[PDB]
Structures are given as C-alpha cells and as structure tokens.
Amino acid sequence: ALHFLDINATEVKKYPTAIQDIIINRSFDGMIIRGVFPRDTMEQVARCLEEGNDGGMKSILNKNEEFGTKVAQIYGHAIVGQSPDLKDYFASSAIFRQACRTMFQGSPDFEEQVESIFHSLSELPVEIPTGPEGQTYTPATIRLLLEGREIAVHVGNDFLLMPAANHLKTLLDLSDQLSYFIPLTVPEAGGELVVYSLEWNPQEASKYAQMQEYMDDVESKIKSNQSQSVAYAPGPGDMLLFNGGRYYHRVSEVIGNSPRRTIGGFLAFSKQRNKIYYWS
Amino acid sequence: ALHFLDINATEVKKYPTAIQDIIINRSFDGMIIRGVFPRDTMEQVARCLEEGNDGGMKSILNKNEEFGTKVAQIYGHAIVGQSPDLKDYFASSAIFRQACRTMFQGSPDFEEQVESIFHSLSELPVEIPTGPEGQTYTPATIRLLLEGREIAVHVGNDFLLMPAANHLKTLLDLSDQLSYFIPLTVPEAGGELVVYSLEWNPQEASKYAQMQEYMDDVESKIKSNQSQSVAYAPGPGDMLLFNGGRYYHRVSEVIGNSPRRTIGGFLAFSKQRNKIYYWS
Amino acid sequence: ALHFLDINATEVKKYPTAIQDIIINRSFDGMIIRGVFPRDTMEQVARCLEEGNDGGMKSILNKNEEFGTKVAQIYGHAIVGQSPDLKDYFASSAIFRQACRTMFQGSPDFEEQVESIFHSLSELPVEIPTGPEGQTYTPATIRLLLEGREIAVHVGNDFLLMPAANHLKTLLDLSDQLSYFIPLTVPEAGGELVVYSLEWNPQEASKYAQMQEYMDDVESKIKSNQSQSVAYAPGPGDMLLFNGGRYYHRVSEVIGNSPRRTIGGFLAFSKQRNKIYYWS
Amino acid sequence: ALHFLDINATEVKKYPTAIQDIIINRSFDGMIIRGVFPRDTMEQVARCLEEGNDGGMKSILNKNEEFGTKVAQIYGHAIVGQSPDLKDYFASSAIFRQACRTMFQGSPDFEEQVESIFHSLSELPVEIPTGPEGQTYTPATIRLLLEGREIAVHVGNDFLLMPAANHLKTLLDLSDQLSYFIPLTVPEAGGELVVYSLEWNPQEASKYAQMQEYMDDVESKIKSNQSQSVAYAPGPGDMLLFNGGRYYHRVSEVIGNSPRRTIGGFLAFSKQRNKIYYWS
Ligand SMILES: O=C(O)CCC(=O)C(=O)O
Ligand SMILES: O=C(O)CCC(=O)C(=O)O
Ligand SMILES: O=C(O)CCC(=O)C(=O)O
Ligand SMILES: O=C(O)CCC(=O)C(=O)O
Ligand SMILES: [Fe+3]
Ligand SMILES: [Fe+3]
Ligand SMILES: [Fe+3]
Ligand SMILES: [Fe+3]
C-alpha cells in the first residue's frame, strides 16, 4: 500500500488536496502526521486517565467484558455497534466532548487541534455531526489495549451497511471514510497498526466466520511474494490518517506491561462535498 | 529479535541497567526512546543545514560520489573506514563539535542531551574519546540519504577488525558496540532501519563479493516461516539505540522527495567497564 | 615612535585607559608587557609543536612555498589575504581554537590569559568575533620563521580595504587595529620586530611594487639625523602590543638554527566602542 | 658584533664551551640567557629594596654624585675606581653578600643560581675571589638608574691598568673579562645596553677627554654604513653575558618614571685557567 507520507505536522499546509487525494482520487493511501500534539500534552492527558483527574471520564469507560479479554477496552460509546436509535451514544458523547476539553486544558484543546489539521489538508470547513434533533456525536474515542490484547481485522466501509449508520448516510457523501488516531501512550513492543493490501469486499468477507480467516486465506492463494501488508507504530502525539474505509486493518498484540492508550475516530466528506465531517 | 522497548524519554530514569543489559547480558536487543529531542529543535536544526546558516558545517560535508549514487552523503568524517592515522578524521571532528554545538543553540545542546540519556541508562560516566595526542573524536555524524539512496547491510563489530580502530581498542572493553541515531528529518516513505536476526562473526562472511547478498543465505537459511527481520522508523527527535554491533542491519531505500537527515554514531564500554564511551 | 611601556604584566592594572590611549588618543604607540605567560608554559607549548603532541594542530600548518622562501610558515589561516567567503578560514579557526586549548593544558589557557590582559588595559569586555552564520574567528595564529626567512614590510590598516574584511567591518569601530604577539621560542639573533615611524599611507605606498622600496625611498628623502625606526626583541612569554594598524612594520631575517615561533593576532574596538574584539 | 645567542636558560647545558669561546677563541661575542631568574623572584627582590625590607642593604647604597647627574646610584662598592687598599670595598662586600642572600630568601639564592649558570657554560668550578688577608670580594653590585640618568661609555679592560686591580691580577688569567647583569626592574623606555663594534684601545682612548668623543670620532672617520653598534634590553630575570672587557659599551638614558634596577658584575678565567672567578 502507498500509505506514505510521514509528514512533519508543520508542513501540513503543503498538502491542501491531501484528503481529496486519498478518498476520491485514491492517488495515495494514508499519512503519518508527526507531532500533531506535544509529547508533553499526551503524557499529562495519559496521566489524568491513569489516576482519576479526568473531567469525569471514568464514568463512560466500557471495558468489553463479554467479548472476551482479547478486544480493546474503550472510553465513550463507539458508534459502530450501536442500536440504530442511538440513545446512549448521543448521551456518552456529550460527556466525552466535555471531559476531553477538561483534560487537554486547552494546551492545545483536542478538538481544535485536530480540526485545523483536517482543515489544512482539505481546505473545507470541519464539523462534528449534529444528531437528528440536536444531539452531538462524539469527535473521537479513547481506546485502551492492555498487555496481551489486540484489535482484530475489520473494515471501515462495512459501517455503511450497519443500521446505526442510518442517520449519517443522510449527511455524508457516501465515499470512503478515513480513520485517524493519535497515541497517548505506546506499548513497549507490538501494538502496531497493520494495513492490508486487500480492498473492501463484503460479499466475500461474510463467507468467513471470523474475518481474519479471510485475510489469511487470501495470503495463500496470492502467493507472489511481495507482502500484502504494511505496519506502522507512530509515537506519542503522532497522528496516523488513512483510508481505513477501503483497506482491511488491525492492531498487533500488545507486548509488555505498558498499555496502548490511543484517541481517535473517523472522517469523511459531506453529501455535496462541502464540509468535512469527523466523528466516532 | 527482542529489539523492544519503545520508552518515553521521560521515563528513561527507570532503566539504569539498560545499557549493560543489551551489551553484556544480552537480555534484550535495543530501545526506542521517544522525545530525546523536542520536535521543534529538530526542524530548526534541519533548517540550518538546509539553508546554510550552519555554524560552518558545510565545509565538512562529504557527498560520496566516490562510491556511486546509492550510499549516503555525510557531514564530518565517520571513523569507520579511515587510514589508521585519523589525521583528517581528528580535524573534521573538531569542526563538527563546534558547528554542531552552534546549530543546536544550546536548546538543548546535542552532546549534553545524549550524554544524560546514556547516563541514565547506565549510571556510569559518559565521555567522548580523546585521541593519542590530545585530539577529539567526534561525538556523532549527520547522515544524509537522498531519494533513491540507501545504506547497505553491515555489522557494527567489523570495526573492531579495522585499521582506524587501532586507537580505541586500547580504550574500549572489546564487548559489543551499540549504534544510536536520532532523525532530524524523516522521508515520505522507506528509509527505515531493518535489524536482522543473523549475528556477528568472521568466517563465511569472508567468502563473498560483498555484503547485502549475505542476506542471501539469510532467508532460505532459516525458514520454517519465521521473521529474520524487524523494521523501525523513528520520528523527529525519537532516538533509536540498538546492538548493531551484534546484528546485521541496514536502512531502506529512501522513497520520495524529502531526504532522510539523521544524526548519530556508536557507543561502548571502556577497558575496565567504568565510564561509557560514545563516538562516531 | 613612543612605542614605550615595557610594563611588568603584573602591574597591567595600572593602565586601564591604555588601549583607548594608543588607538583613539594616539597619546602613545605600544607596550611591551613582560611575563604575560610563564617561560615554562612557552617552552612546553613550543615543545608540543616541535614534537607532535599538539592536540592535532600539525594539520593546519600552511607552509607557504607558493610565495618563495621569503615569507613565514604559519599554523592556522591568517584572515588577511583570504577570499571574501571565509569558508576555509572559519574551518581552520575551529581546529585552531581546539588544538590551542589542548596544548596549553590550562596552565594558563591561552585565550583566558590574553583576554584578561586586554581586559585590564581597556576595562571593556573582551570577545572573539562570532561569524556571519555562527562560525568562530581565530583568537590568534602561530607564526613560524625558519632560519634565513623574514616577514616583509606591511601595515595593519590595509586590511580595511581588503574584501576578506567585509564581515568584521560591520562589527568593528573602524579605528586603528592593534597587533599583539607573544614569542614561544626566540631565535639566536635577528628576527626582531621593527616598527617604522612612517604613518599609514595607501595612496603613495601602492605606487611601489615591493613595499620595502617605499620604506627606503622615504628614508632617503627625509634625511635629518634622528632615526626613522625602533626595534624590539621580546623574550618567551613577553607580550608585545602596539599600533601596527597605523605604522609600517616587519620582522628581521632570522639568524641561526633555532626558529622564531610566535603566537598572536590583532585587536580592536567595536562599532559603538563597548566590547573589545581580538582575532587573527 | 656576533653578540648573539638569546638562549633559553634551560638549555644553558648545551654550551659547555661558551665562556672559553667568548674569552679565548673570540669566536663570538656574548649571550642573552633568558629566564635565569623567575620574574616573580625579581619583582619581590625589587620590592624589598624599594620598601626597606632589604636585609640591611640601605646601609651600603652609594648615591653617586660627587660626579654630576651623569652616572648611576649603586648598592655596594664597585671595585673599579677604588683606593688600591680595598679597605672599604672589602667591608661593603661583606655587607652586600649577607643582605643579598637575605633578600632572595633562597628562592633561588642569587649566588647559587648565577654560579650554576657560569658553571654550565664553562664546566669549570666557579668562585668569588677571597682577598689577600681573608676578606671577600662582592659577587655582584646593584645599579640604580633614575629617570634621565645613564651610564657613560667604558671598557672592561681598563681595570687591568688600574691600581685597585693589583690583587686580582695575581688571581686571574689575564685574558678578557666578561660583564654580566640581570635586570630586576626595567624602565618604561630606553636604558638599554649598547655595545660598540670598536675594540679595546687604551692608547688612543686616553687622548680624549670624555670617552664618548672617541666613539663619535671613530664613527665618522671610516664612513661605510653598516652599523657599528648593537643594543639590547633584557627583561626581568634575563641575564645578559658578554665580552664587555673587549668592546666599548654603555647604557641608554632612562626614559620615564620607573628606574632601571639591575644586579650584576664581572667574570674571568683564573691564573692557570681552572676555576672561574666572578666578582664586582
Ligand atoms: O488503534 C486504534 O485506535 C484504532 C485503529 C482502527 O481500527 C481505526 O483506525 O479506526
Ligand atoms: O541511520 C543512520 O544514521 C545509520 C544507520 C546505521 O548504519 C547504524 O545505526 O549504525
Ligand atoms: O611576529 C609576528 O608574529 C608578527 C609580527 C607582525 O607583523 C604583527 O605585529 O602583526
Ligand atoms: O646595567 C648595568 O648593571 C651596567 C652595565 C655595564 O656597564 C656592565 O655590564 O658592566
Ligand atoms: Fe478502524
Ligand atoms: Fe551501522
Ligand atoms: Fe602585522
Ligand atoms: Fe660595564
């Protein structure tokens, strides 16, 4: 995958076509924007969580008990895997927006930082979606991978077929959706983003029990031997931004004591490609 | 290879046994210390070079058109591969030290920063080697990889068999030597450190033309269907520290316009293992 | 010339107006400061050179066989007669500053010593010029006159019309510049500083091919019966400091085996006469 | 005059024939031995005088004029121009020896230093003459030139025709006598030794009233135009040693406030050239 930019956050202005290029033109596949947040910012935010001085965010922590101890714990309600009503999603999302502003102590505030990055890369306005009759979506979600845990293979564009999506399908240009995330703490080893070469293909994916078996099965029947995969491990405060709507991806198993705290969501164009919408 | 720590530079204090461990105990193979330098420092240093406002360092740049256009250009003379006199090495090394101190505007000074990091990791004293007749070795070297170029496969401990080494072998405990480097600028793609599992020794290394096709053997050497490799790409200000004395390694071909500027050298114990020596 | 003080370096404090006096008021013409350096220091420094234990200085020795065996060899690059770039000047100056500190083993360090003398004589601060893009100028230069050789007539203030001067002219008050030098070894005979009574006169000097013929030609057309000259021969560690910017001068042919080794440079005021600048 | 050595006191050992050479072979004319005494010693000795903490030497100071303000004040009796009895000479000579040993505080003792120097230069024993009836001669004499004063022209070898000499003529090999002196303090300008090229010539000297009009008168009658003279100015602790017995010589008029304090005497071979005698 030509998932390549590894850009200094500073020179982000040099790519005012970058989002349009990944989604629509598909000329490249993702970016690594280095230093979107100060490593200091990330360590104090990551410390708030670890103790409890967190603007009230322990109160939306959804350790995912009965999915086994092999998928990620997660602060705030992730819109993926929600009842199509969105009762509790719109609810936790307000808590998240507030508890987050607190923790970042405006040095620099999470939401505005991310917005200017997305702004500079698209040159369109950036908004978090307003719900049907005024609720707020959440701009992002903090994922917690404890040692041993991992996030399994999945694709962005399956969300377009999910009933919870039904509101946003009315707001969004139904292009590819992008993923983005910024690490608060990194693990000692592993726990790296792995993007597969293979594109969005629901028809053939569904015929497998667990979707990793689809990735494996492909990697046998394709035996050229380039590699089908490419893996990154962005450090604290480095943003990773990519066409996760299109490409199958995952996170490696976390090695060693220290967990992988990591905040982010998704990102896409809107109906008539005017605003840039970013949610989770 | 358990080339694994990915530590935040801040908590470098928690590992005061770390260097002895990589070299002497071989209990693990390397570290990535995140944020040894402020991203801000790294880009202004990189701007100084790129412009010319460089404390006079342009006068020791060695573009190596002597070797075809696939090896790195390099500021200051790297001690590896010099006539045993070290005349032109000791000279350029004096220029390096001043121009380098200059460029960092003591915010924070290169020699001082790196020294405290190596200190915290050993709790031994850290010194730059003084030459036979009072000269100075250079503490490091700025390597410049232009688009298309690369660094070929090699091992640190071959230096121990080299003529230019003859001085230091009197100064060093002849254990493993470590490599270390800090990226000033990162490329768009590629140009990543790849460390191979294959260890240092003198025998069948001698039997070739030379050495990337020692990563001939390397792969149909092994396999079950292992990894002979591990690959890293540290961002601006992130230090990479590893037992490159022991394991064969290289740097990927740099892809894309912007070049891979990178400052660093090597690192080892001293005759009766008290102070820690670091040079380039 | 009232080139007269022959002061014991000790009582140098008694003349805190001295530099302002020679340069600006021109109330007297120069000093001989006896014992700025220990005779022990001068013999051990000169022995480091003579052998090779020189902190790496042999590598900036510029024998000038390109000019006939009529002018002096010289360690380090003298700023006079340089391309206006100062690329190789600034480079050697870095080397010089290092090898010099080394050789003096801080007993007492060259730069520190010299600075305190210049300090006491002006009561202004003393600095070595930092260059346009962060380089260092050389605080001094070691001159080597072998037996038979000599230094030809010249004036300090021509440097003001030289293109290599273009940087410092922005830094200096464009007063007269003074010379200073301290003998490491003295020759058996000859090799003495000869300062002529004649003042700086570029227009009329330029009409001569060899500038000595200007000194001769004047000394015929003037014949009163005083003397036009005054000549000195300071022993090891004796500093000679005088207005060589204003007056024509030279060094006699060296007689006898032992060469005339001598370290020194020039000395001047700064733009708005605060700081004292000294270089070579 | 080949009055040339300007040797470092250290390497005085390299010339074990030098005294025999100046006196007997007349192969050269004199030496300047740099650093016989520490500048530190010289100024603390000079401070003792200037104050009064002088081991009692004020009691042999002969402010001298009886003779017009033409010649120098002088501590102790100089043997030249004495009653042939030597009663008052031998008496002041005892005083001088004690106050002098005193003032030097054995750091290094005057007699002992000078003796080792004369020793290294002859490889003969060195002694101060014991008088006829057990008295001592003085090893040296401290001369004091105040501002404006000077020493008139003279030759060493007239002393041989003087009645005050009659004793030593039984002691000395009647070769040439050398003069020697070491400055304790130097004046601001002038007050330098001038040795003329002209040799010892009593018959023709005696015909002039003032011995300078013999020097002027000669320098007119064979007007070629090299120079007939040579002039020296040794700093504190530098010894000047030369065949002043043979050549007419003098001291410049002292310029400026600070006087020219200076200790020294003469030096010659002994009857059957074994021992080296030195007195004043
Ligand atoms: O590592 C994360 O925070 C999530 C990775 C992922 O699957 C995504 O890009 O949404
Ligand atoms: O990245 C660099 O600066 C050179 C890499 C290398 O060969 C080393 O670390 O020893
Ligand atoms: O003797 C020297 O070192 C140089 C003399 C000279 O020309 C100067 O005073 O600058
Ligand atoms: O400076 C002196 O001590 C006197 C010089 C002199 O005439 C002598 O050497 O005897
Ligand atoms: Fe995802
Ligand atoms: Fe290497
Ligand atoms: Fe000069
Ligand atoms: Fe005399």
DSSP states of B230-267 as a string?
A: EEE---TT-EEEE-TTTEEEEEPPEESSS-EEEEEEEE
Written as six digits, the tokens of D7 are 């040797």
- Report how far residue C245's alpha carbon sits from residue C202's, in angstroms, rounded to the nearest whole number: 12
Residue whose token pair is 């220290």: A258
- Report how far residue C249's alpha carbon sits from residue C230's, in angstroms, rounded to the nearest whole number: 10
- Report how far residue B39's alpha carbon sits from residue B235's, in angstroms, rounded to the nearest whole number: 9
Q: Count Cβ–Cβ pairs < 8 Å, chain B vs chain C.
A: 68
CA distances from C266 to C11, C120, C271, D31 (A): 22, 17, 16, 32
Please name the method used to determine this structure. Answer: X-ray
CB of D112 closer than 8 Å to CB of D120: no
Chains with ≥3 CB–CB distances under 8 Å to B: A, C
The atom number, within ligand 3, closest to the CA of C263 reads: 3
C273 labelled ligand-binding? no
Fill in the DSSP letter of residue D209.
S
Fill in the DSSP letter of residue A130.
B
CB of A95 closer than 8 Å to CB of A56: yes
CB of A280 closer than 8 Å to CB of A183: no
Binding-site annotation, residues of D for Fe(3+): 154, 249
For the sheet with A229-232, list strands across it.
A151-154, A247-251, A193-199, A229-232
**Does residue D161 sit in helix, strand or coil?**
helix
Mutate to test the interface with C, among B44, B50, B59, B87 (most CBs of C within 10 A): B59
CB of A234 closer than 8 Å to CB of B235: yes
Chain B residues whose CB is inside 8 A of the A35 CB are 39, 235-236
Closest CA to B212 of B196, B231, B225, B234: B196
The protein residue whose alpha carbon is closest to atom 10 in ligand 1 is: A179
Ligand 1 centroid – CA A181 distance (Å): 6
Written as six digits, the tokens of A199 are 């594109």
Instruction: Quote the strand ranges of C165-242, DSSP E.
Output: 178-183, 189-190, 193-199, 229-232, 239-242
Residue whose token pair is 């605080």: C139
Chains with ≥3 CB–CB distances under 8 Å to A: B
Report how far apart the first and last C-alpha atoms of chain B are (Å, whole number).
Answer: 25
- Whether B251 lines ligand 2, by a CB cut-off of 6 Å, is yes
- Report how far residue D234's alpha carbon sits from residue D32's, in angstroms, rounded to the nearest whole number: 8
The number of beta carbons lying within 10 Å of the beta carbon of residue C59 is 18
Specify the number of domains making up chain D.
1
Fill in the DSSP letter of residue C61.
B
Residue whose token pair is 């910017």: C245
CA distances from A163 to A85, A88, A171 (A): 9, 15, 15
CA distances from B180 to B45, B126, B177, B238, C91 (A): 18, 14, 10, 11, 27
The number of beta carbons lying within 10 Å of the beta carbon of residue B250 is 20
Report how far apart the first and last C-alpha atoms of chain C are (Å, whole number).
Answer: 24
CB of C233 closer than 8 Å to CB of C144: no
Q: Identify which ligand lies nearest to the alpha carbon of C187.
A: 3
- Whether B30 lines ligand 2, by a CB cut-off of 6 Å, is no
Closest CA to B129 of B141, B139, B119: B139
The atom number, within ligand 4, closest to the CA of D251 reads: 5
The protein residue whose alpha carbon is closest to atom 9 in ligand 4 is: D179
- Report how far residue B196's alpha carbon sits from residue C272's, in angstroms, rounded to the nearest whole number: 62
Helices (H), chain C: 18-20, 39-51, 87-104, 110-120, 202-205, 212-221
**How do D30-34 and D7-8 pair as beta strands?**
parallel
CB of C154 closer than 8 Å to CB of C205: no
Residue D250 neighbours by CB under 8 Å, 6+ apart: D150, D151, D152, D153, D154, D193, D194, D212
**Does residue A264 sit in helix, strand or coil?**
strand
CA distances from A117 to A20, A24, A130, C64 (A): 14, 19, 21, 60
Helices (H), chain B: 18-20, 39-51, 87-103, 110-120, 217-222
For ligand 6, a single-atom ion, the residues with CB < 5 A are B 179, 244
Chain B residues whose CB is inside 8 A of the A236 CB are 8, 34-35
Closest CA to D182 of D273, D280, D59, D248: D280
What dihedral angle (degrees, nearest 10) is formed by the CA atoms of A74, A80, A85, A91?
30
Domain that holds residue A3: 1-280
B97 labelled ligand-binding? no
- Report how far residue A250's alpha carbon sits from residue A151's, in angstroms, rounded to the nearest whole number: 6
Written as six digits, the tokens of A139 are 């701009």
- Report how far residue C63's alpha carbon sits from residue B136's, in angstroms, rounded to the nearest whole number: 24
Contact C94 B58 (CB under 8 A): no
Using the Cβ of C60 and the Cβ atoms of chain B, whether some distance falls under 8 Å is answered with yes
Report how far apart the first and last C-alpha atoms of chain A are (Å, whole number).
Answer: 25
Q: ω before A187 within 30° of 0 (cis)?
A: no
What dihedral angle (degrees, nearest 10) is formed by the CA atoms of B206, B210, B213, B214?
30
A239-276 burial, b at 16+ Cβ within 10 Å, e below that, comes to bbbbbbbbbbbbbbbbbeebbbbbbbbbbbbbeebebb
Give the C window 124-183 contacts with B, CB below 8 Å: 131, 133-136
- Whether A244 lines ligand 1, by a CB cut-off of 6 Å, is yes
CB of C152 closer than 8 Å to CB of C211: yes
Largest CA distance in chain C: 53
Using the Cβ of C216 and the Cβ atoms of chain D, whether some distance falls under 8 Å is answered with no
C94: nearest CB among B58, B98, B134: B98
Written as six digits, the tokens of B244 are 């490159």
Residue A178 neighbours by CB under 8 Å, 6+ apart: A19, A22, A23, A30, A156, A241, A242, A243, A244, A245, A266, A267, A268
C249 labelled ligand-binding? yes
CA distance to partner chain B, nearest, from residue A6 (Å): 5
CB of D179 closer than 8 Å to CB of D112: no
- Report how far residue C146's alpha carbon sits from residue C160's, in angstroms, rounded to the nearest whole number: 29
- Whether B259 lines ligand 2, by a CB cut-off of 6 Å, is no
- Report how far residue B31's alpha carbon sits from residue B154's, in angstroms, rounded to the nearest whole number: 19
**Does residue C179 sit in helix, strand or coil?**
strand
Mutate to test the interface with B, among A34, A145, A195, A216 (most CBs of B within 10 A): A34
Ligand 7 centroid – CA D3 distance (Å): 27
- Report how far residue D71's alpha carbon sits from residue A94's, in angstroms, rounded to the nearest whole number: 108
